[model samples]
Target: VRLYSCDACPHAVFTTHAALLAHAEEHHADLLPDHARLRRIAQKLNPVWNRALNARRNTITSWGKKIFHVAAQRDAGESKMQEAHRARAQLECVVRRWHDKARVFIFGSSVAMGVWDGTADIDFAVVDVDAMERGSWPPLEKNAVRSITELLRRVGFSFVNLEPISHARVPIIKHHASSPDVVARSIRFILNGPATREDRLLLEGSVRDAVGPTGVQQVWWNRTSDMMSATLESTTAAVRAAMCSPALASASLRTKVQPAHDECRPELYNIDFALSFRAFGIRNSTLLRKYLLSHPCARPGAIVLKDWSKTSGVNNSVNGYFTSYAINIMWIYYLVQKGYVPYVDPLEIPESLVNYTDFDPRYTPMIDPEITNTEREELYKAAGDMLVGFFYFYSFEFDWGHNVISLNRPGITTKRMLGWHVEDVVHPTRYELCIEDPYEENLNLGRHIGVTKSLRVRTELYRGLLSLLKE
Candidate 1:
């Protein structure tokens, strides 16, 4: 029997469900229509989550209770219940017009998170189907998404402007697969995770592949094994940069290294080796800067681009990445020049491993700043277009793996747990490869600020507020 749905669902439902679906499909295939009940059930099971656990490696499990609560909370942030209701109404309205036999529900962050702001990205899925691939993509209408996003944004929801993609075309995520229907499925995003811990594990595992170092991808869950292989084979450019930097010159001697944390313990001890190296390891930070100047990632003389040269508004997410990239590269070069690679990962070094180093953030030349009104005006001019072109290839739209695959190079990979993965409810504790699995499984749960680009830079560095340390 076909079922109909007119409700909001969680986006985290898929990856969390991939492992369990076979069982669920077998046992409860009968009750396929009632999305609301399923949503409630998902809440009790693996559930939804907010940022609360350690991202060291597998800390996602610790948020089980919190995930449960977030899932159950009818008010999903700003009047979530109200917005969800609106989405249900909007969807039902559309479904009714078609007189379809399927139960349509608001799935993913798009639902409880709010509507698709005219320019918002959204997705749709058949929560429960006789066959695995039995869902229709959203209707093609600007008014639909526009009305959704317009209605939702007023209530306080913001999102990135997304363009459609195909698995054959994209690749940044490490473990996610891609799909041919990427363009259609992406117009909107679904929100239900089918509520399960293993589900979240799969996201950390793979439902989609990366478009390169970029998180945006061409497909969703199209190729599992290949994506996982990529995720395991190499770390991000950030990691590659630091590993090759002089700061890690000594650690580079090791041939094989795990994702993050204790080199001795692959399971525990590593919590985001890439970012930890950047945030706490001042040496890594400097090494990264020097390297980017000529690291082959940036075009020759591309360093001269004002936006990448300093922190400011050129709107070059890719080229702009060069500034921080170059900065971090330089820090490594400095370490290499000073013979301080032994001191890159301070937590790993013995307290006796001391070295007086020379560095200066002050002298670091704050060349990039908010664009002056005159510059903003000039940005629209022809010369501005040329500068903008220099950065276009670096933008998220460009593929690092395909667009510039030749620059790919391996780095000194090391796993060091410099910090602990903990939440107030869970008690933040340091992690390393040596620690047991309970904590070992908690690393990927927590959010990584740097990777998330939580501090996304706008047009100008002055307006971006990234230079200042967060409390």
Candidate 2:
């Protein structure tokens, strides 16, 4: 069969109109043409929507926010630390200027990832569902000009790229909200329109959640960048990243852009490369973006993707994935028995590290804690092998500061982490042992830990169930 779709031909135009009528819906909801849409839009137009996702988390999201707040924290200067004057200031200004209603949400990360590398951008959406449905919403370009103009005046140096995306354009729009009800509503619209992504759903229920009987005001996140509240020199970059993620994530996916958008799972994923690059994009360039992805080398016993092959052309929020892991996050899972857990809050980082220095005074890190003579001697007395072992396992790769379970998931790949995986991989006996969806249901996940609390849970189950049958 021969077909034609010439843009300049009158007969072709007439035929297209007739075809459009043939495919028109009863409700006039505007149905898409057919399976051929992917070809016309992606194959021929060179649209960003067709761009595949190849990036992965480098750090958890909380850490990224801390680094993101660096710029905002910097402008607020040293005094802002006791409280978040700058974050409040920015939000307040947006409320006064935008005036429709106020909505805000915040998510943070705390791992070795963003400790040195630059932060991923902050994401924000301001939707007007009524306006959107009525076709009266302001253009994103104009709204951005207005929002940024006002945000800069009040927030002071918070670099945000505001967008007015649409719901129909994004993957989640049909499944998620119909329009921008809260601040996130606008964000989803903007993000979906350009990028057609589905990440905003993780935080979408909030705008409505924030509303009260008669339109009440509410606070979504109590603080900005939960870990080390942004310091004087660091908040600028941190704020920019925090303010820009929505605009960036909402942008049309780029061909050469492998974004580090998801939060790393302390137990399953290795975002050391991405996180380190964000905090300290200095020394290494060979860092992997999706370091602990679905490759055969990914650690054992954690939620994994069904197919590495499918992820080759995937695009999703790195932080969104991290949320899944962080929610079930057991920082003390390993140290729980050993009794050395990470901070109680994934959002709350340990105070001891707020001052650690990765750079000299000129560049000046956050509060640099001065070690006592005892501490100095402790470092001096530590053996060379001990130091090597510490760095070998501790380099952002192992995430020693958080839960040790994050070190081992399921499977192995690339052969580099083989030696380390031998020591960290978990056994399949514990039901806590998770696997990527495509992985065999009863597969042997790495190895087992015979003496762990998880093992106790298994023993009790066997004693009550399996052993009952045996008896």
Candidate 3:
């Protein structure tokens, strides 16, 4: 068999000239001969080329499954995940009494998405229902952090500590419940309690009465400590019975407590409260969750990509690079290009969500591609192929300098079209790599990627492709 090869890429070779010509047309279009007859020959041989490519894709698919299994194992177990949700619910219950109109829910990869590694903080977005309903979203009031901080402190739960991060881009209250003693107390107070409606009402009334107009005055503050002590000391028979229940007590005790060295055990999860009047994050999480559920390969593929990027030191946005979220968008965009997932339209999303930011929208919604069941099955079996293709697409195919990775638009979008060119004097680094946020069309998720970092990202992508091919 005559083996025809591509000069542009080392790994590309074909058993027939027709297949080689087709490879040239697909991977090195610019280098193709300017002859109509040669183009026609390649076109005639397209079926033969596809047959060869599909054969290679099958091998890559096997690699994807292996990678997926490894990555999937890193995800948090069901029991631990249940504890995370229960913890979120318990915290929300505590916060709801203070702000009845404020809605608290978990957002980020920690939720429904199978992306969390069980160690990252659980992101809680507190949306102002009244503000949202009144069309005053992205609420002007910035006192949510201060209010929640004060309220939690006054509630005087020794289990949790509130650290107000007022200087962050989006101010948040870091809720820490790490200490072993604190974890134990928290489990007992929040998780283990079996309060009925009357018990809850009595507790709420007592808490409300304790925190007065002056906000936990000295008398009430002293009384609050006395209250906690008195309750523990004067536990009724029923209360003692519930606390001593072996199953309930053991489960709650083990839920958030992880054993460590020095005979210390700490709470297994961290929590962050994003005091946002706008629920853009909640909406974003929902959209991504939908994408993840659309295919069996989606979540595991994302997990593998995220793990690779993090381990490779390219996923740290704080150090001027892509974030895990940005990587996820890039993954979804690749899946869209390969017909595995559809490009979500901004118009399809709620108008309020798309209009969350004040900046002019950069994209008009486009129709999503309708994938067939056969196509889905092919992708389902070829996750390794997709993984390899992801690296190849970014490494060789995508023109990072000129194009934007966008999910809100169909087909390709250019940086010039979005006014994200590299020559912008005011924001030189903003367009180094353009990955647009699906909802906030004006905001580039890749804004933090600088010129050097952009090159590093591409280099890493190329390295990934090379590593896979070499293996």
Candidate 4:
């Protein structure tokens, strides 16, 4: 028997055209022939896309690769990651001790696979369970919010800012509350939604189960996007219809709604919400960690770059600089461009883990295989070599202006196609580098790296290259 399928949808097979047409009208009317007039028109007009990534050649010698590996300092990063994980475990205990209703969660550069320095303060999203479940969007009422503030004050919190911070995109009660040992290290608790361990884990497991068997590795976690949507959707019953439109929804997903703050100090412990168009929280650890595990050099390379960002001032998100998350994307792009690793393809992700109904498949990426010598030293050397190649590619080559780094699209994507042109309204800053997030298509990790900082970063890279280019 022959089967009919809706041309617009991946699934939605039908027995006849009548069924297909009916389904299209309700669920995908916008994707129908005449309905997608603009998309079709744009496709025809934009056939010739620009290129930034080029094929690998004799970029560096064997000796150069060896030296570059040492310069990256992989051992240091390996140790730093271990310490961060330990700190995370201890922080969880701190939260549990304070209030059974209170929840402390971690999602930051380290969790996102970009931690280098010991000075970096781990981030926590703190929330009260009982009050949050009381039906408020943020879950904390005026009285309840202040109550938590005062509770911390009596417990010896150095400072607690209980006043409603109106300027922030997502309102939060900022405070430094913990033991001297915990406080000495540094941590930021952003009082927001009540996100429990079980809730976060369940959502992640559901996402993984959705990708069932197609070999997908991971999916984008739209905590920020979804939560932000609910914020608007819940404002009033009347606006829900308008706010849920795909155009509005898509725009909302891409909005850079960040918290407002007066000034930033490096040592002062503070935390901010992950408010870019794309939610920075990814569902799987392997999407990032597995790759770093591929070669010893991978983690080290990320650590070195992150450290460079801190000292050079390029990774300061508060100052409108690129984030360490952006640096990770850049490194991933470099791995593929320089042939250090295979390009990540979305189709390889498990089918059960994928979100089929309204999710984008292009965001899922394949995982890397383990680098085993079947002994150990050989694997170490392989990773070390990759690190050398990594530094060589970024320093000697790489077009800061012409190329846009991406893990989804093969090779380079032009700045124009990505709406990354300097003057584009959607793109607020003019960038010398563009590293697109794998899942958040609208977000450019390096979008905030301005021309001046880009130049500074480039200069440092060259200096770093020279320092290691010797015997």
Question: In TM-score terms, which candidate is top?
Answer: 3
Name the regions of candidate 3 deviating beyond 4 angstroms. 1-62, 112-117, 137-142, 154-161, 177-277, 351-381, 426-429
lDDT of each: 0.25, 0.24, 0.55, 0.43
Residues 1-471 of candidate 3: C-alpha lDDT, one tens digit per residue: 444444455566556645754565566545333323333433453356445446656556566656656655656456556555555544554456556666566677764364455566677766655667678654433476666666555334233456777666777777655543322222122323344444434443443343333322121112222121112211111122112212232222311111112222222233333334357676776677667666667777887788889987789977777889888889989998889877776566554433443111111111113767566446545777678778867865787757999887888989877777533331234566799888786788777654435545655675666455433
Give the CA lDDT, 0 to 100, for residue 139 in model 1: 32
Ten contiguous residues minimizing lDDT sum, candidate 1: 270-279
TM-score result, candidate 4: 0.47
Off by over 4 Å in 2: 1-88, 96-106, 110-160, 165-332, 342-368, 376-471
Candidate 3: 10-residue stretch with minimal lDDT: 358-367
For candidate 1, lDDT tens digit of each residue in 365-455? 1111365756533322322222222232222222221111111112222222222322121112211111111112333211221111211
lDDT, candidate 4, at 169: 58
Candidate order by lDDT, decreasing, is 3, 4, 1, 2
TM-score of each: 0.18, 0.24, 0.64, 0.47
What shift in Å separates residue 164 of candidate 1 from its native position after superposition? 47
Of 2 and 4, the candidate ranking higher by lDDT: 4
